[PDB]
Amino acid sequence: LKKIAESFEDPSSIVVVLEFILFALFFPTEFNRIKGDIQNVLLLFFSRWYPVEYGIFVQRGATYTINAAGEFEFSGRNEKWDQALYLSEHFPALFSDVP
Amino acid sequence: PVEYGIFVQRGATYTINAAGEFEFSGRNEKWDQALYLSEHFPALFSDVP
Amino acid sequence: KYPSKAIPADELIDNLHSWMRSVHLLHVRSEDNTLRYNWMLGVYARSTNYTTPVGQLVVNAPAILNYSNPQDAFNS
Amino acid sequence: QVGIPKLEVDHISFSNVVSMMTANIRTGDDMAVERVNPDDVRAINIRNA
Amino acid sequence: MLQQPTGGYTTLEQFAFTIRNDGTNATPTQFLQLLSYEATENELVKKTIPTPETHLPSARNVPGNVYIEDAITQALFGISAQNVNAHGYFSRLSALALPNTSARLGLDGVIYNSETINIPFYDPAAVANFAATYAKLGNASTPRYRADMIDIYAHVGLELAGTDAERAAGVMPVKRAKFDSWEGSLISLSRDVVNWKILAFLIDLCSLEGEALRAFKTRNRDVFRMMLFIMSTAVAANVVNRKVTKRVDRVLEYIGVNSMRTAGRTATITYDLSRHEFAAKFLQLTFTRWNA
Amino acid sequence: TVTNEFASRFRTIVATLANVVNERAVQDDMQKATRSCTKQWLRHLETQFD
Numbered sequence: 001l002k003k004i005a006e007s008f009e010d011p012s013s014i015v016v017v018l019e020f021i022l023f024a025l026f027f028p029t030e031f032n033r034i035k036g037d038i039q040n041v042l043l044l045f046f047s048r049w050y051p052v053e054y055g056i057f058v059q060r061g062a063t064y065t066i067n068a069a070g071e072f073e074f075s076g077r078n079e080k081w082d083q084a085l086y087l088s089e090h091f092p093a094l095f096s097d098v099p
Numbered sequence: 100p101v102e103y104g105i106f107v108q109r110g111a112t113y114t115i116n117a118a119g120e121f122e123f124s125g126r127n128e129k130w131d132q133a134l135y136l137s138e139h140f141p142a143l144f145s146d147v148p
Numbered sequence: 149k150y151p152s153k154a155i156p157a158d159e160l161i162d163n164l165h166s167w168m169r170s171v172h173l174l175h176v177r178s179e180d181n182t183l184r185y186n187w188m189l190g191v192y193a194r195s196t197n198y199t200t201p202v203g204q205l206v207v208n209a210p211a212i213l214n215y216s217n218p219q220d221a222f223n224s
Numbered sequence: 225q226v227g228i229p230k231l232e233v234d235h236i237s238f239s240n241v242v243s244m245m246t247a248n249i250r251t252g253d254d255m256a257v258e259r260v261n262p263d264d265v266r267a268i269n270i271r272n273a
Numbered sequence: 274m275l276q277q278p279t280g281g282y283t284t285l286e287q288f289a290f291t292i293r294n295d296g297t298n299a300t301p302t303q304f305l306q307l308l309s310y311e312a313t314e315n316e317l318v319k320k321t322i323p324t325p326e327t328h329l330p331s332a333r334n335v336p337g338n339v340y341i342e343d344a345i346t347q348a349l350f351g352i353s354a355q356n357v358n359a360h361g362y363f364s365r366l367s368a369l370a371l372p373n374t375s376a377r378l379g380l381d382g383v384i385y386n387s388e389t390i391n392i393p394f395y396d397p398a399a400v401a402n403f404a405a406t407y408a409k410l411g412n413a414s415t416p417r418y419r420a421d422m423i424d425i426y427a428h429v430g431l432e433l434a435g436t437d438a439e440r441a442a443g444v445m446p447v448k449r450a451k452f453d454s455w456e457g458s459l460i461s462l463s464r465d466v467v468n469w470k471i472l473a474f475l476i477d478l479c480s481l482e483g484e485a486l487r488a489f490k491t492r493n494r495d496v497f498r499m500m501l502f503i504m505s506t507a508v509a510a511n512v513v514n515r516k517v518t519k520r521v522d523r524v525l526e527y528i529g530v531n532s533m534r535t536a537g538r539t540a541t542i543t544y545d546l547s548r549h550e551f552a553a554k555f556l557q558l559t560f561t562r563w564n565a
Numbered sequence: 566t567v568t569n570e571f572a573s574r575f576r577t578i579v580a581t582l583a584n585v586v587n588e589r590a591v592q593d594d595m596q597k598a599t600r601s602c603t604k605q606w607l608r609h610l611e612t613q614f615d
């Protein structure tokens with residue numbers, strides 16, 4: 001991802017989030033390739049707009065790794081996601097879709 | 100300044116509840132006209148003692 | 149105002165009373181009996197007038213001040 | 225047996241391994257970046273770090 | 274592949290550990306003989322070591338062959354190493370932790386992703402044992418998993434300076450180690466240890482079991498103590514020399530007390546903060562294996 | 566013949582987001598303004614997309 005420097009103070013900052021959503025729609029494949037690096041912007045979003053939910057979400061784990069039997073196992077540990085992880089077993093946790 | 104402190108501790112605005120009681124924000128915020136169409140009211144004009 | 153002699157109880161009571169009326173701590177009341185309100189961070193955020201990042205975090209999401217487990221009050 | 229370190233003794237050795245960097249390394253080169261200034265000065269926070 | 278003997282890999286003459294001393298290749302034990310101790314008023318009392326975490330850090334997709342041995346030995350006794358946690362290639366040890374992995378830990382101390390011709394390597398089962406603990410060196414840096422860098426050193430003291438009685442008691446006076454010494458002795462010792470093939474010692478410490486393991490612990494106690502000595506010099510508050518009738522005695526004070534000091538000095542190899550967390554994690558793991 | 570499943574999807578997306586911006590607490594008056602303007606611009610993007 002070409003890095004965005006958004007800090008998400010103004011409501012207008014929602015634009016960047018929408019720009020991701022549209023990108024997730026028009027181009028699901030490429031989005032799936034850059035999704036962790038976009039997760040890094042989404043975390044600065046959630047921490048400013050939903051600090052409580054962000055606290056709980058991150059406390060579960062910033063990332064996960066599916067195993068045999070297909071169950072997810074969240075890291076329990078907040079950390080920035082490098083693209084160096086895309087080839088790894090790790091997944092960005094925002095996209096687990098696990099309630 | 101004293102009465103103002105006491106006033107604005109109650110809140111800079113309020114909203115009517117579905118039960119019709121007033122509910123003041125408790126926050127000191129500057130008003131904008133974006134709030135005119137909102138649930139919010141300026142608290143100066145509540146006429147609540 | 150009283151350099152040499154005790155502040156009369158009338159004036160002390162009335163002044164402390166009106167100043168006490170002026171204070172108000174951001175909070176969200178809740179039904180669960182397990183909650184406690186993080187008085188430290190609440191009054192601290194109030195004192196800085198909600199400018200420091202803890203103050204912002206509190207003025208935006210007052211419910212963050214409620215805590216069941218005492219430690220998680222700050223971890224949040 | 226491990227070999228005797230060369231600096232440990234008084235003889236002069238005239239053939240020696242030297243580590244060195246291939247063209248792929250390079251050091252001391254100026255490197256380029258993208259600075260991105262904060263969107264608003266008033267949105268910056270200093271304390272509590 | 275090298276088959277592991279009835280004893281450890283350390284039984285082989287190929288893996289002998291020998292610091293240079295007095296113009297010869299001294300075994301570490303006959304250097305430890307030179308050591309003497311000035312007891313002081315303080316007491317070291319060893320607390321139980323916390324159990325190392327179950328978690329084994331992910332060995333992230335690295336295409337290349339990591340030189341794990343060199344990294345461990347330089348984070349441990351290196352004269353210039355720093356930011357040992359920054360790259361985080363110690364996690365790579367975890368690739369060996371899986372059953373039936375194609376990875377091999379070579380005698381060179383490299384972790385090949387694939388078995389390869391003309392490169393001898395350790396038996397994969399024993400290496401899986403060794404990785405099953407020492408992959409956790411990969412989380413020496415992560416906040417959830419750092420070792421105590423203060424308490425563990427009391428254990429170091431006991432295993433180094435301790436008499437058999439003080440050792441069985443679990444509590445010894447803080448001691449000031451010393452030895453008649455040559456110029457630049459601590460740097461020469463540490464460089465002579467950085468050359469050691471310590472993975473042999475580690476793999477045998479993890480793989481061997483039963484009486485065969487116990488004979489290892491006695492036979493290689495002095496080796497362990499030598500590594501311990503280099504670490505303890507790395508954390509000693511000061512390393513004075515004493516003149517005494519045209520003979521100089523190096524004196525490090527104190528054994529078993531981490532001073533946390535990070536500023537460099539000519540006398541001994543120095544820990545950055547990262548090397549403090551590294552060595553402390555390494556000690557947690559290595560002692561946790563050592564006592565059983 | 567008339568409804569587009571894609572555009573309707575985007576409609577629920579901008580509706581969700583409009584609720585998000587609406588629920589946003591703000592303190593500065595200008596932020597209070599850009600809140601409602603953000604809401605209008607979303608509601609216009611919806612029609613572009615349609």
Ligand SMILES: Nc1nc2c(ncn2[C@@H]2O[C@H](COP(=O)(O)OP(=O)(O)OP(=O)(O)O)[C@@H](O)[C@H]2O)c(=O)[nH]1
Binds near residue numbers: 187188192
């Ligand atoms: N600003 C602020 N400080 C607090 C609050 N509660 C405790 N402290 C401070 O926290 C410090 C340590 O807290 P404690 O361990 O509970 O109490 P203490 O160290 O024995 O100190 P004191 O009880 O105040 O004499 C004290 O110096 C208090 O001043 C609070 O609600 N707001």
